[PDB]
Design an enzyme around this catalytic site. Structure first.
Site: not given
Lengths: 226, 244, 241, 242, 50, 246, 217
Positions: A1, A17, A19, A33, A47, A129, A166, A169
């Site tokens: 993410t 984001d 997802r 999120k 994480g 990430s 990413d 993400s």
């Protein structure tokens, strides 16, 4: 993410984001999120999704308890310190990475906090990430002092670059704008980079296209005298 | 009156705790303890009564030392005052480990006052019944307190307690008059003795032994030690000369 | 004199504190169970009332401890509250461990120990609660018991606790029928409750009702708490209103 | 008849006689305190009564520094004065590192007050006989005075007074605020707000004060210090001179 | 003992009123006073709370 | 008999419970009136000195945004117990249920803190009887009285404190089965002016409601799917408004 | 909200600076603009929910009456405001209608009118309305008969009311009744029962809940 924060003059924005991935498979396409610590503190999780979710809740109840107790507005500043303490106690056996930001009367603040209990301040942060992909966008395109406008544009741009480079993400961008002495503005699905592609056949068919062996009623309620 | 003793946390209608006042009365029956603070030191002298003439002389002290620089002398019950100094040595020692320095005199004053206060606050302990005069020398110079069994303390230029507080407070009251300047610790050694000698006319039935101690910044290197030998004899000659 | 703590006995081998705890009970309203082979009715009366006491939104003298055992309360409702929670928690503990809804006997016997325990050990107060336990277990069928605050139990065919225990007991045993009907059992509870209680008219709002039946549809056990309007209608039938 | 030999056992009026005999232990040192609000300060001026000449006066105090921005004035007895002062200090410390910011006047006074309630809730401690008044200029409330009582009752204030001759102080204050029609003193530096507190106290008691006979603590914006006897002295001829 | 005192109170309200006739409004006040007073011996609605 | 929490009386009951009840009666007068879309809760403030700030007393304290309270009885007992009440509400019923608890459930926790302070002898129960009003999406608007005897009762309109007995008949007479919140707010002030006169004014009477959701108090926006605080505290200026039109 | 506001300001500028003559026309518009709000054929001119407007309308129409200088016309308007009262069909009427009449008592409108207005309100106020509304009008009617110097008509009403409110006495309002009665009897010139009623009012003012006005009386 991916999660970013951009400090601006009249407040601070936190974007992240929607997802959530747990392994190479996508757990949810849309799921929040941006968790609510207090009406004027928000934070986003990165994480392991379980550790971030639990922590925010645990700390959130305490900062609402604190508001009532000190009989004054909830500080961002209270929250971090208490949270930091909480994180320390596990000794890094809890895998929570967060960006916490808020507005309180001391002003706007934008913090990063790690699983270890390392703590940082900047005027632009990211974690997750896809943090390396967004970080590049912030350092170049950010300058000191911004309006509301420029801050919101710069925040969605960073996540958007996040999605495209990413893997973990994906999907849409949800943005929350906390300005000093104003309501947090929760703008669900501010940005879509790629809308859904549809499937090319109808897959709905009659019954008996799937085999049955028995048909039963299972209880779920208490009968009367009839 | 009757009622509100028999407990040590029960308020009286007057607004007091009776039993805590009865503590002070026990301290009064105890032997005379004085401290004279001096301009670069403190002097503690005490009247140690002779039970019988079978007592070993200069081998029993009501003076005890705390850490390596804080003098304490108590008046009241002899073992109660002991018990309160042992707790004090452990507390001074924890401070000393923790911060890597010796205690301030204001530091000790706070800590001791909490331990006396703790036994007036609860129902299963009898409050203390000793006063304890203490002090020493620090960075900030010399300082002297006297802690009452009520758990009350203040600094003093000079402090007295026991049977002889009637005489002793009066002699000290002349001492400030004759010296507002401070009075050197040396000349206060000779002074310490005269004060006790006149305070021993309140315990005249028995004989006494005079023990003087001191702690002085420049004549004891900040450290507490017993005054003995030639200094101790000179003070005896001084007190003997002027009493007759 | 001996009206003190619980360790001490009276020289007549009386613990005054269990005796007084009994007497606590008749300062809260009448509570009646009548057992029938068609079902058990539990019926209760309110200790006091006013015209703006809300009592149609909730019960507070009839608690379900589980899905087959329920209790009527008479006595101090504060003492009651803690014991009902402890009973109910245990009722589900039994569920978790054996995969059966707790037997009536195991549940009464547990609570008899607990009441006894607060008298026997320490400085804690005894309890002054009488619970009429009405249950089903597939061993003994239908079951009625009541437990003393003393911390013992007896099984019954009819029992009355709460205020006016002696009279309420007498009228019950006078007109009792061995096989009975569920319907008659409900009628005999209003008939008694009228003469014992010093309220002028007997109103639906001074009544709580629950019935436990297996004869309202077999195969299954149905706990039917009467709503205000059901209570209100059955007074009509018996012609008190 | 039962019912101050116990902490917890009520009277048949629903009063706790023993707890109230603590509101009546605040006369035991026989000092008066006044604390008033200015417009950029909170002032507290309480007597310093040094009774004996065997005492050194500069260790006699009732004003305690609790924290960087927090003072406390004690009326009532010394043994309990010190217990009140350590707990408020201990809590001041706890709040800063746990919640990562300074401690306001409310937050401290509420916590001590709740603490007093706990001490009366059990029968395993007693109430203390001390009245605490906290003084500060708060970070977003400005001037604040919170009086914490021995039961654990608290109410804020424009002005409060404590002690034996408190009633005489109270009429003078009431008449001032009535006539002014503000909940503040409009003097715009603390050196004259201090003078104003001295002024009202001389009139109420009928007594002159001198250097040794006053104690003055001053909460200023974002800092706190208790004034020496020679600075108090400057204030005292400022009164006399007009 | 209550019910002879109800009649005493009513007749004292009726004196204020100054009529041969004693009205029923006086017997509304007499009950509302005897009744209220006995609920203060029970310390509120304590039967409810036990 | 009367005079331990441990001793039962010949006719029963503990006496400490009765004496704690006495304490309440020495209190101030608080009262609640249930309307069909609200509950209004009202009480007064006193403090002796007029030099006292009145906006510093806590007596109308929100436990949760869904549930307000008042007291009659001991002032100290209130602050401590409000503090404790909140703390329990998140532990048992906001970490588990996931939202601030039901009006019925939370009233039971409050009673359970009291009850523990009766069981343990030498420890008195709280001096207060509270009124706790709230809203939930199951049992609707609701009103309770929770006594220092550790039992709670639901009510339609009720008053507690010194002036209770005078207020309750006003409540019987003036309550009707269908009312609006605005007719309840005026009835509330009217009755409370019986409790005291010579000092009743919009800055010294503290009055609040648990009425309709207000997103104005929510403090974050662009989330339609949750509700805002049911609770609303009316300011001093509002209390004056209502007192003029009366 | 915006529109009624503007119309109100506009009439007011004319009243005091140009003439009253021009303000009459604007006053006509204020009555129509209110009429729409009251019967709600546009949602009260704000759609959906009536909102602020339901109140705004009755408030500004009682401002209009009072302005204004007594006219022959004004007489005719006021007891017809009770048709306007029921038009909204609301329970917030009670408070405004109490004030409303209070406004009309102050400006004198001669013998018939003040009494005639009040009897019309009372008819509508026992159709389905409160006991609260009814009693506040009754205190007022009693005051009106006194001011016109009707002492038989005043005294008889005070008796019809009072005897029922002795059975249900919980009102701070009966201090007022007692005082009117005393005035009645004083001006019929009997002191027997002028005395008897002053004592009564004094007993009613022992429990203290009286406005300034009440004690002054």
């Amino acid at each position: 993410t991916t999660i970013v924060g951009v400090k601006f003059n009249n407040g601070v924005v936190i974007a992240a984001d929607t997802r959530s991935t747990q392994g190479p498979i996508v757990a949810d396409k849309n799921c929040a999120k941006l968790h609510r610590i207090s009406p004027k503190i928000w934070c986003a999780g990165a994480g392991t999704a379980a550790d971030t979710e639990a922590v925010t809740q645990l700390i959130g109840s305490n900062i609402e308890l604190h508001s009532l107790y000190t009989s004054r507005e909830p500080r961002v500043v209270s929250a971090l310190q208490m949270l930091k303490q909480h994180l320390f106690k596990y000794q890094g056996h809890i895998g929570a990475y967060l960006i916490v930001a808020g507005v309180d009367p001391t002003g706007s603040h934008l913090f990063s906090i790690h699983a270890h209990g390392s703590t940082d301040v900047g005027y632009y942060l990211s974690l997750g990430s896809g943090s390396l992909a967004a970080m590049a966008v912030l350092e170049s395109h950010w300058k000191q002092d911004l309006t509301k406008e420029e801050a919101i544009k710069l925040a969605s741009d960073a996540i958007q670059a996040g999605i495209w480079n990413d893997l973990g993400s994906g999907s849409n961008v949800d943005v929350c704008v906390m300005e000093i002495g104003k309501d947090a503005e929760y703008l669900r699905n501010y940005l879509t980079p790629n809308v859904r592609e549809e499937k090319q056949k109808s897959y709905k068919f009659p019954r008996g296209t799937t085999a049955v062996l028995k048909e039963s009623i299972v209880n779920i309620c208490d009968i009367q005298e009839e | 009156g009757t009622g509100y003793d028999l407990s040590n946390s029960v308020f009286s209608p007057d607004g007091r705790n009776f039993q805590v006042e009865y503590a002070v009365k026990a301290v009064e029956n105890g032997t005379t303890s004085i401290g004279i603070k001096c301009n670069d030191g403190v002097v503690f002298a005490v009247e140690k009564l002779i039970t019988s003439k079978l007592l070993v002389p200069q081998k029993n002290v009501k003076i005890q030392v705390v850490d390596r620089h804080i003098g304490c002398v108590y008046s009241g019950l002899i073992p109660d005052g002991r018990h309160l100094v042992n707790r004090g040595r452990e507390e001074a020692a924890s401070f000393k480990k923790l911060y890597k320095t010796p205690i301030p005199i204001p530091a000790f004053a706070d800590r001791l006052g909490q331990y006396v206060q703790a036994h007036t606050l609860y129902n299963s302990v009898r409050p203390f019944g000793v006063s304890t005069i203490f002090g020493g020398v620090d960075k900030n110079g010399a300082h002297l307190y006297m802690l009452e069994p009520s758990g009350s303390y203040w600094g003093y230029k000079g402090a007295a307690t026991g049977k002889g507080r009637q005489s002793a407070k009066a002699e000290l009251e002349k001492l400030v008059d004759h010296h507002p300047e401070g009075l050197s610790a040396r000349e206060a050694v000779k002074q310490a003795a005269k004060i006790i000698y006149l305070a021993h006319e309140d315990n005249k039935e028995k004989d006494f032994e005079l023990e003087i101690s001191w702690c002085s910044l420049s004549e004891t290197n900040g450290l507490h030690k017993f005054v003995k030998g030639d200094l101790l004899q000179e003070a005896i000659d001084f007190a003997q000369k002027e009493i007759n | 004199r001996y009206d003190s703590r619980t360790t001490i006995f009276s020289p007549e081998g009386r613990l005054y504190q269990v005796e007084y705890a009994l007497e606590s009970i008749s300062h809260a309203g009448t509570a009646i169970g009548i057992m029938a082979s068609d079902g058990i009715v539990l019926a209760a009366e309110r200790k006091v009332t006013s015209t703006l006491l809300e009592q149609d939104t909730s019960t507070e003298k009839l608690y379900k401890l589980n899905d087959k055992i329920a209790v009527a309360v008479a006595g101090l409702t504060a003492d009651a509250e803690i014991l009902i929670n402890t009973a109910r928690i245990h009722a589900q503990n039994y569920l978790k461990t054996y995969n059966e809804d707790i037997p009536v006997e195991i549940l009464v016997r547990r609570l008899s120990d607990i009441k006894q325990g607060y008298t026997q050990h320490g400085g804690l107060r005894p309890f002054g609660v009488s619970f009429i336990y009405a249950g089903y277990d597939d061993r003994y069928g239908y079951q009625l018991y009541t437990s003393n605050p003393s911390g013992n139990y007896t099984g019954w065919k009819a029992i009355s606790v709460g205020a006016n225990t002696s009279a309420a007991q007498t009228l019950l045993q006078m007109d009792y029928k061995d096989d009975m009907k569920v319907d008659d059992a409900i009628e005999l509870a209003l008939k008694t409750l009228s003469k014992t209680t010093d309220s002028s008219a007997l109103t639906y709002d001074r009544l709580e009702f629950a019935t436990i039946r297996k004869g309202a549809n077999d195969g299954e056990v149905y706990q039917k708490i009467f709503k205000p309007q059901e209570i209100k209608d059955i007074l009509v039938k018996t012609g008190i209103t | 008849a039962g019912y101050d030999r116990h902490i917890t056992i009520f009277s048949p009026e629903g009063r706790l006689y023993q707890v109230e005999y603590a509101f009546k232990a605040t006369n035991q040192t026989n000092i008066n305190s006044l604390a008033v609000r200015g417009k950029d300060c909170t002032v507290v001026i309480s007597q310093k009564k040094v009774p004996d000449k065997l005492l050194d006066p500069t260790t006699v105090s009732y004003i305690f520094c609790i924290s960087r921005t927090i003072g406390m004035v004690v009326n009532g007895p010394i043994p309990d004065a010190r217990n009140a002062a350590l707990r408020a200090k201990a809590e001041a410390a706890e709040f800063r590192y746990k919640y990562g910011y300074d401690m306001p006047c409310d937050v401290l006074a509420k916590r001590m007050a709740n603490l007093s309630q706990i001490y009366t809730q059990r029968a395993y401690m007693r109430p203390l006989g001390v009245i605490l008044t906290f003084v500060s200029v708060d970070e977003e409330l400005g001037p604040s005075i919170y009086k914490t009582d021995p039961a654990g009752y608290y109410v804020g204030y424009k002005a409060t007074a404590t002690g034996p001759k408190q009633q005489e102080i109270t009429t003078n204050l009431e008449n001032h605020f009535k006539k002014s029609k503000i909940d503040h003193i409009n003097e715009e530096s603390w050196e004259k707000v201090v003078e104003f507190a001295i002024t009202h106290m001389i009139d109420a008691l009928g007594t002159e004060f001198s250097k040794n006979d006053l104690e003055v603590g001053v909460a200023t914006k974002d800092k706190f210090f208790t004034l020496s006897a020679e600075n108090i002295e400057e204030r005292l001829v400022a009164i006399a001179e007009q | 003992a209550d019910v002879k005192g109800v009649c005493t109170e009513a007749g004292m309200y009726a004196l204020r009123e100054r009529r041969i006739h004693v009205t029923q409004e006086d017997f509304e006040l007499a009950v509302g006073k005897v009744m209220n007073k006995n609920q203060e011996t029970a310390i509120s609605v304590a039967k409810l709370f036990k | 008999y009367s005079f331990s929490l441990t001793t039962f009386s010949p006719s029963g009951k503990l006496g400490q419970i009765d004496y704690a009840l006495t304490a309440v009666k020495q209190g101030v007068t608080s009262l609640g009136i249930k309307a069909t879309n609200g509950v209004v809760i009202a009480t007064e403030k006193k403090s002796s000195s007029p030099l006292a700030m009145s906006e510093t007393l806590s007596k109308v304290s929100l436990l949760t945004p869904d549930i307000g309270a008042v007291y009659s009885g001991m002032g100290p007992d209130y602050r401590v117990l409000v503090d404790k009440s909140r703390k329990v509400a998140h532990t048992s019923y906001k970490r588990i249920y996931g939202e601030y608890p039901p009006t019925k459930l939370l009233v039971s926790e409050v009673a359970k803190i009291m009850q523990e302070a009766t069981q343990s002898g030498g420890v008195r129960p709280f001096g207060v009887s509270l009124l706790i009003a709230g809203h939930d999406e199951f049992n609707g608007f609701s009103l309770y009285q929770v006594d220092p005897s550790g039992s709670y009762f639901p009510w339609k309109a009720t008053a507690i404190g010194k002036g209770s007995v005078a207020a309750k008949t006003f409540l019987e007479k003036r309550w009707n089965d269908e009312l609006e919140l605005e007719d309840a707010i005026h009835i509330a002030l009217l009755t409370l002016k019986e409790s005291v006169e010579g000092e009743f004014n919009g800055d010294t009477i503290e009055l609040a409601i648990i009425g309709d959701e207000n997103p104005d108090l929510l403090g974050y926006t662009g989330i339609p799917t949750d509700k805002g605080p049911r609770f609303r505290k009316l300011t001093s200026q509002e209390i004056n408004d209502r007192l003029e039109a009366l | 909200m915006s529109l009624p506001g503007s119309k109100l300001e506009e009439a007011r500028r004319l009243v005091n600076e140009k003439q009253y003559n021009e303000a009459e026309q604007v006053y006509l518009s204020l009555l129509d603009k209110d009429s729409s709000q009251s019967s709600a054929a546009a949602g009260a001119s704000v759609d959906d929910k009536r909102r602020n407007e339901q109140e705004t309308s009755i408030l500004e129409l009682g401002q209009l009456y009072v302005t204004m200088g007594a006219k022959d016309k004004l007489r005719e308007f006021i007891p017809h405001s009770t048709e306007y009262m029921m038009q909204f069909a609301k329970s917030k009427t009670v408070k405004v209608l109490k004030t409303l009449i209070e406004k009309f008592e102050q400006v004198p409108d001669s013998l018939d009118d003040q009494i005639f207005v009040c009897e019309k309100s009372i008819e509508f106020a026992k159709r389905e309305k409160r006991v609260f509304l009814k009693h506040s009008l009754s205190i007022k009617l009693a005051t009106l008969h006194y001011q016109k110097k009707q002492y038989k008509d005043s005294l008889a009403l005070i008796n019809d009311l009072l005897r029922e409110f002795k059975k249900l006495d919980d009102k701070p309002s009966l201090v007022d009744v007692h005082l009117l009665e005393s005035k009645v009897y004083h001006k019929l010139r009997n002191l027997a029962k002028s005395k008897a009623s002053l004592t009564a009012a004094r007993t009613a003012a022992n429990s203290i809940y009286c406005p300034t006005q009440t004690v002054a009386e």
